Amino acid sequence: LYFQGSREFKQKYDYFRKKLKKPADIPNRFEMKLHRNNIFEESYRRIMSVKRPDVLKARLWIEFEEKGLDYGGVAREWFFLLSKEMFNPYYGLFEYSATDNYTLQINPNSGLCNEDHLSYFTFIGRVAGLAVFHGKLLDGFFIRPFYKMMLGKQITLNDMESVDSEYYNSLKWILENDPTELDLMFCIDEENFGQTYQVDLKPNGSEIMVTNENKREYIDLVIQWRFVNRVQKQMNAFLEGFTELLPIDLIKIFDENELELLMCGLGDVDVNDWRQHSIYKNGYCPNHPVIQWFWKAVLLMDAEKRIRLLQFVTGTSRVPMNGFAELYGSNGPQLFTIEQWGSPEKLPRAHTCFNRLDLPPYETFEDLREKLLMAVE
């Protein structure tokens, strides 16, 4: 299945769009004149200067540095280029949810990176609200608890699985079995800029043991800590900006899976960029049957498996912001590499520090495809 509940998504989408009003009370165009190389700070100033947010709902008229293009197409570029910045953890406002993940979460230390952080979150919410209002997608994916918080839905243990399987399986184990052999206490490690702090989940938590009686409270507190309690001013600031463009009661017709799709579309890896920036070693080359089989097998995979493949080889499911040319390994720049290795009766292997697939020279297309899918799973 590819878009479960699509009947209902489109029904909500039609209703939503009818309920959105374009005021006739406003200028014909909202204009922006920007430099690609300075898009984040320039858009912040322009968007945060406006005092009547209804003027933002005018037809977007964005120009970079050129006049002869479609304005919808250019707005779509602006949204894409600016997403790439807003969501770049370099700014300290968002961070990747784990090293192997591409999904973003609010950085709880945002106010330490930037005294005016809440102003920035408001700006970001204004831009997300603007995107939905004008029917554009953002380029980036937030963790599932972010969408839930936008909708005022409670964050749960099941929200942990998509973010951190290992940790979800541990907490699920505790929920389903007597925790006492684990010797856990109501405190957790919090790492802030390379420094670790033991923080109490509850008063004098560090001295309270987790038992069959209190383990559910323990799980709730951890989940609060992990997703909620540290970022409420951020999220509140983000929601103030978002709802300057969209009434929260309209957006709340969507559930959290529908909201992600509406805001962000579907995740995938660009195979053409991938293929153009890969290197072959130990006897492989672009025309080699094994390599041509390889790329066709990659193209035949679903989005999710391609992502799993990328993570299998590189250690992460994220693609550098400037695409595969800028792929990095353990010791600096390292393009994605396929090296002839092993016997055709072995499965492929990876050296993640080198972004390197060790790929045996299989004897047919179908064998390669089957052995590769198995390795990926």
Place this chain on the structure above:
Amino acid sequence: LYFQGSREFKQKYDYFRKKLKKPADIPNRFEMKLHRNNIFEESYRRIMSVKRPDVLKARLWIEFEEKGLDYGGVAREWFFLLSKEMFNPYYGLFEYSATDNYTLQINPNSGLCNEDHLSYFTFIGRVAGLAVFHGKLLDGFFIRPFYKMMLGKQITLNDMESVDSEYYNSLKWILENDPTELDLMFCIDEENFGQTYQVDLKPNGSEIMVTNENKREYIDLVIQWRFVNRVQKQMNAFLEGFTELLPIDLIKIFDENELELLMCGLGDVDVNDWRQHSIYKNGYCPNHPVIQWFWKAVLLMDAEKRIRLLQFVTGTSRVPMNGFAELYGSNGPQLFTIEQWGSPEKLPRAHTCFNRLDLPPYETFEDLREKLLMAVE
């Protein structure tokens, strides 16, 4: 099925590579210093200066205009960028085989575009031979009769189908039925730079009627005319260059389908470039459920269907050389367009002069996918 006979292709490929010899009689590197903007003429001069073709079989050391990249990756760029020029019909050496096709054939008027045309065909054969020798792919596809001619295989009526269905069906009809009602003669129209010439297929052909007795000769002559007789000096010049790097008896281990794959890989459309340069009209936009369904359905199609889709909407299965940003319609530049149109009980329609898909607002993903595939077929 995706790579039929792949067991045998790889077997031939292994044998082939063992039979290819890298002389120890040569310099360590063959060097090229080039400008991207002048790649065709500069590479011609450098490649055609060499008198001992075995020096070409040295490790390729190509630099543009930058030193810090993989040399194999840069050679792969050179081969790609230069393919794009060699095979650009602007030069008069190759032409597209039909308006709706991307496959290339030798231009029979090459010697009128360029007095030194055979020197250029030799250069091109040297570059193709160099590509195979070093295991690189070319960027472009020749018609099936081109590969056959490289291998000295006879061109037949069945070779017409992949090039021109309509004409193949006509000639097949004649082979299978009494041709007399058609009133055909042994002459054909030949268009040269916008001028039409009646040319005799056989002496005084213009006055000889096609009958049940002579129809097979008629078909053979047409096929000769269409693919063979006009381009033998070209093809001979191309083969002289190719075989300076590869003995013809080695290349002849492959059949014509294997040879294409070896030289050129598989055809496809880059969906990311496609999607980034499409425009939405009459109520559609990037986040619209119908649009997000659309792109996922395109991504799920095989290469062949995507190509058929592109041809359905634009009138041609070819992509501009600089990708979808440079898509052209009937009245100049026209990006690929999806416009909301019709009732969900209709199939999508296209206006090819506008590169425009008329796409009804279907109610589910599965309905859109089914109705789109049907239209495409």
